[PDB]
Amino acid sequence: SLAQIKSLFATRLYHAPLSEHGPALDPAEFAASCYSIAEDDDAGQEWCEREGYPGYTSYASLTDLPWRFPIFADLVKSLDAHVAAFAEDLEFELDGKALRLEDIWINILPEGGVHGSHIHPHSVISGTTYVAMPEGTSALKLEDPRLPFMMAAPTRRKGAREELRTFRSVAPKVGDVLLWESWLRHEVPMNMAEEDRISVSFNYAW
Amino acid sequence: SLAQIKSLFATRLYHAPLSEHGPALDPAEFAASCYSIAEDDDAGQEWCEREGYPGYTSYASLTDLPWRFPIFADLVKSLDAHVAAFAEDLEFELDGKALRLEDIWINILPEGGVHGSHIHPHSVISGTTYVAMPEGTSALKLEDPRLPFMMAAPTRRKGAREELRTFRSVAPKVGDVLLWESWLRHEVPMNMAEEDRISVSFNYAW
Amino acid sequence: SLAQIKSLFATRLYHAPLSEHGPALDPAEFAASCYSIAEDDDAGQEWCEREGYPGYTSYASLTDLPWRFPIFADLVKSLDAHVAAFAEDLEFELDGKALRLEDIWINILPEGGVHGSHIHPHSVISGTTYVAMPEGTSALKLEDPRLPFMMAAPTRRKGAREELRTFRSVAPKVGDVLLWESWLRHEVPMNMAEEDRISVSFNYAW
Amino acid sequence: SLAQIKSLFATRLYHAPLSEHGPALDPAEFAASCYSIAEDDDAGQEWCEREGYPGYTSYASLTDLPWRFPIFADLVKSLDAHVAAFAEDLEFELDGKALRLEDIWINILPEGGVHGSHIHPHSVISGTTYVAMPEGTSALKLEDPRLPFMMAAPTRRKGAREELRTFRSVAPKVGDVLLWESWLRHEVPMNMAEEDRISVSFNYAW
Ligand SMILES: [Fe+3]
Ligand SMILES: [Fe+3]
Ligand SMILES: [Fe+3]
Ligand SMILES: [Fe+3]
């Protein structure tokens, strides 16, 4: 035999321009629409304040964005195709049943805003597209799903083989879309800029 | 931006001939020694029968194999170097402190023997070298550590990108050594041959 | 001292007489039936041999036991109601959408048979009903979902107090049903009784 | 009905008055001290700003609080004994080898401060002592180690019954110590009181 060391059980991170598919979205219309919706949403504004929610999110107040706003139906038609390419990369056996949009929402993170580590319970693919970035810094940090199984293990060198690293930081530009499997833990670092960081996040189910 | 999909958080499986390092072991002496030890070990033989242990294991009866048997000290001197190469691949930050042998034991799996899925609690590297194989079939199956986080996810196609597969089966030859991180779940498929499958398994701590 | 130690995030295991729900089911007939169907099932017997599976499962060979065998349709009427009571205990938000049977199979574990550690991927509630239990005969043995998080911890003394143990064994009587959440790992230790341990296992999805 | 639902594999959370162990420690002096050390700690203040950390931790800047500040040496004498009582409850096999302090740090969380979800990698017992708690002020909130195993399950109604919840909030009083196993995920929700929430957090290893 020959000595071999093999990579197994790898997580895949998908990172593309939104414009890789689906109809075109105007970035100016895109940002302005996010703002116009958030400003008309008294109920979501109050829930954020009561719940101690760092930014604005539309998640508790608005459940039907693509029904109500052509630009959001347009967005979901791109996202649909991005999720299809990704389900393909991930080798999902879908039968006759594509992944479909379960939830979709706006975030507006002002300066000083942060979102603590979490997963999206009961979804298959989750993701975020970036509507306005600030335009440093990292906007997403993904944590190794095996981290809590690694308690007895030495910490790892922060070396140049990215597949061995324990956290992965992502620094998207406006227009980019990120996708991942929903069980993956992820955090959103503090907005250090004075301008808002606007993004749209979403869950796809099977 | 360019569309990219990246592999993250990968498990590494190390698979080498034992003879890749350390002093040479005679395979005939190696097998015969395993047998001679197991046959003199009344206490381990009785514990196996009482505990409903599929084969013979020396694990409960003999804690000091390398102290008692030059061939086992020889083996540990090879294994020491195999574990060093692997800790290097895994990018462990070890300070001034190499991984050292914690436990080491013989298994003799007769026809019809199987070992159910398990991990090795409280170790860093675990592994097995193969002393006598039978010489079909698969002797080790490794399970994706993320399997139980994948309950809502479609099953995956059994395709040709091994890093996306949910189980990995390993079919070693005599003389091979396998190593993995101890939190990784692994099972030993039934010995379908009539001859015993003899192996030596071990845990390294930090 | 005002020191309090609270228990949180406990895994629930449901245990009831089968007869508390559903049509009357005679245990002597029930045993007789499982033996009878397993005898005719050459496919099953052969897949078992081929796949190195100890004893005897119908899981690969036969797929609609409830529709074919009236006594399995009665069993399933009972399971539904047991499952519903468990979901009530858990207390899942079900809409008006009751969990339904997804698979059900017969196991016959002879003297010396073991069934290795495993979960039931992609199910919500999993469970077993006990058909013939020699003359003890092997427990179902449950494993702590947290075990792989525990690698840095010291070992726990079988401080029993069956709350602080890594595994939990159950010796059910004939006629009992056990249910658990499908992510919960479990095995069947070696049947050391001369007679067969017969059981029927199943999964429920939403 | 003879139906039983048993609780297994429960996570333990220890809660006691700090004063039940160790030298006397005055809470007014204790508060005064934490404020005082945090004020001098420009390094800490600056790392915080730089690293987008809300409020104020000493964890990056100061590394031997017990040796430098007598009141922290007294605190630690107390923690040792609290930890030992918890290890006794757990009941780890410790040899004659008591778990010892590995790190300890001051947190000061102002109005609007949050501390994101996280574990304490590579520790055995982790915990917090409460120093100034406005005028409620944020709970410590604990997350079910099993959450990522639960992706196929329905959502659970805040059926409280603080046994079946995915998170568990604690509102401790000034002078309380809380301890948990270091793999347990937890966060601090937004401090909504105008005044600072001061606490001291620590890890113990074997
Ligand atoms: Fe998220
Ligand atoms: Fe093993
Ligand atoms: Fe099972
Ligand atoms: Fe903490």
Minimum-distance CB partner of B3 among A17, A142, A172: A17
D122 min Cα distance to partner chain A (Å) = 4
Phi, psi of A173 (to 5 degrees): -115, 160
Q: What is the 3-state secondary structure (H, E, C) of chain C?
A: CCCEEEEECCEEEEEEEHHHCCCCCCHHHHHHHHHHHHHHCHHHHHHHHHCCCCCEECCCCCCCHHHHCHHHHHHHHHHHHHHHHHHHHCCECCCCCCCEEEEEEEEEECCCCCEEEECCCCCCEEEEEEEECCCCCCCEEEECCCHHHCCCCCCECCCCCCCCCCEEEECCCCCEEEEEECCCCEEECCCCCCCCEEEEEEEEEC
Whether A5 is in a domain gets the answer: no
What is the C67 CA–ligand 2 centroid distance (Å)? 41
C52 min Cα distance to partner chain B (Å) = 5
Angle at A107 between CA A104 and CA A112, to 5 degrees: 155
Task: Return residues 137-166 of C near A (CB < 8 Å).
Answer: 148-153
Minimum-distance CB partner of C17 among D2, D17, D150: D2
Please tell me the distance from the alpha carbon of residue C45 to that of residue C61, in angstroms, as a whole number. Answer: 9
Which element (helix H / strand E) includes D74? Answer: helix D70-89
Phi, psi of C37 (to 5 degrees): -65, -40
| Neighbors of chain D by Cβ distance (3+ pairs < 8 Å) | A, B, C
Residues of B with Cβ-Cβ distance to C115 under 8 angstroms: 116
CATH code for position B85: 2.60.120.620
The number of angstroms, rounded, from the C-alpha of A184 to the middle of its chain's C-alpha atoms is: 11
C-beta atoms surrounding A160 within 10 Å: 8
Give this entry's resolution in angstroms: 1.9
The total domain count for chain A is: 1
Among all bound ligands, the one having the nearest atom to the CA of C188 is 3
Residues of A with Cβ-Cβ distance to D139 under 8 angstroms: none
Residues of D with Cβ-Cβ distance to C205 under 8 angstroms: 152
| Neighbors of chain B by Cβ distance (3+ pairs < 8 Å) | A, C, D
**Buried b or exposed e, range C129-159, using 16+ CB within 10 angstroms:** bbbbbeeebbbbbbbbbbbbbbbbbbebeee
Residue A201 touches chain D, beta carbons under 8 Å = no
What is the C126 CA–ligand 3 centroid distance (Å)? 7
Among all bound ligands, the one having the nearest atom to the CA of D186 is 4
D157 min Cα distance to partner chain C (Å) = 6
With 0-12 / 13-18 / 19 or more C-beta atoms within 10 angstroms meaning exposed / middle / buried, residue D104 is: buried
Please tell me the distance from the alpha carbon of residue C204 to that of residue C206, in angstroms, as a whole number. Answer: 7
Whether B1 is in a domain gets the answer: no
Whether A4 is in a domain gets the answer: no
Residue contact D90–C14, C-beta within 8 A: no
Task: Evaluate whether B7 touches A14 at the Cβ level (below 8 Å).
Answer: no
Minimum-distance CB partner of D148 among A116, A183, A187: A183
A-D contacts (CB, under 8 Å): 64
Residues of D with Cβ-Cβ distance to A139 under 8 angstroms: none
Phi-psi group of C23: left, alpha or beta (phi > 0 → left; psi -120 to 50 → alpha; rest → beta): beta
Among all bound ligands, the one having the nearest atom to the CA of A128 is 1
Q: Two tokens at C182?
A: 């499908």
Is D118 annotated among the ligand-binding residues? Answer: yes
Task: Give B157's DSSP letter.
Answer: P
> DSSP of chain A, one letter per residue?
---EEEEES-EEEEEEEGGGSSS---HHHHHHHHHHHHHH-HHHHHHHHHHT-SSEE-TTT-S-HHHH-HHHHHHHHHHHHHHHHHHHHTTB--TT---EEEEEEEEEE-TT--EEEE--TT-SEEEEEEEE--S-S--EEEE-TTGGG-SSSPPBP--S-GGG-SEEEE---TTEEEEEETTS-EEE----SSS-EEEEEEEEE-
**Buried b or exposed e, range D140-170, using 16+ CB within 10 angstroms:** bbbbbbbbbbbbbbbebeeeeeeebbebbeb
Please tell me the distance from the alpha carbon of residue A123 to that of residue B152, in angstroms, as a whole number. Answer: 7
Whether C58 is in a domain gets the answer: yes
Minimum-distance CB partner of B54 among C114, C147, C151: C114
Angle at A197 between CA A84 and CA A131, to 5 degrees: 40
As a whole number of Å, the end-to-end CA separation of chain B is 43
Task: Give D69's DSSP letter.
Answer: -
Task: Evaluate whether A149 touches C146 at the Cβ level (below 8 Å).
Answer: no
Among all bound ligands, the one having the nearest atom to the CA of B120 is 2
Whether C68 is in a domain gets the answer: yes
B121 min Cα distance to partner chain D (Å) = 14
Residue C34 CB contacts under 8 Å (≥ 6 apart), including other chains: C106, C108, C131, C132, C198, C200
Residues of B with Cβ-Cβ distance to D93 under 8 angstroms: none
Task: Return residues 29-88 of D near B (CB < 8 Å).
Answer: none
Residue contact D152–B152, C-beta within 8 A: yes
Residue C93 touches chain D, beta carbons under 8 Å = yes
Whether B25 is in a domain gets the answer: yes
Whether A89 is in a domain gets the answer: yes
Q: What sign does the dihedral C53-C57-C59-C62 (CA atoms) show?
A: positive
Among all bound ligands, the one having the nearest atom to the CA of D178 is 4
| Neighbors of chain A by Cβ distance (3+ pairs < 8 Å) | B, C, D
- Structural domain of A125: 13-206
Phi-psi group of A81: left, alpha or beta (phi > 0 → left; psi -120 to 50 → alpha; rest → beta): alpha
Which element (helix H / strand E) includes B16? Answer: strand B11-17
Minimum-distance CB partner of A117 among D52, D118, D150: D118
Residues of C with Cβ-Cβ distance to B145 under 8 angstroms: 148
Minimum-distance CB partner of A1 among B10, B16, B146: B16
Helices (H) and strands (E) in chain D, counts: 4, 11
Phi-psi group of B31: left, alpha or beta (phi > 0 → left; psi -120 to 50 → alpha; rest → beta): alpha
Whether A174 is in a domain gets the answer: yes
Please tell me the distance from the alpha carbon of residue C87 to that of residue C123, in angstroms, as a whole number. Answer: 13
Task: Evaluate whether C60 touches C52 at the Cβ level (below 8 Å).
Answer: no
Is D186 annotated among the ligand-binding residues? Answer: yes
C206 min Cα distance to partner chain D (Å) = 8
Q: How was this structure determined?
A: X-ray
Residue whose entry in the numeric block shows the structure tokens 């609007």: D112
Please tell me the distance from the alpha carbon of residue D178 to that of residue C4, in angstroms, as a whole number. Answer: 10
D113 min Cα distance to partner chain A (Å) = 9
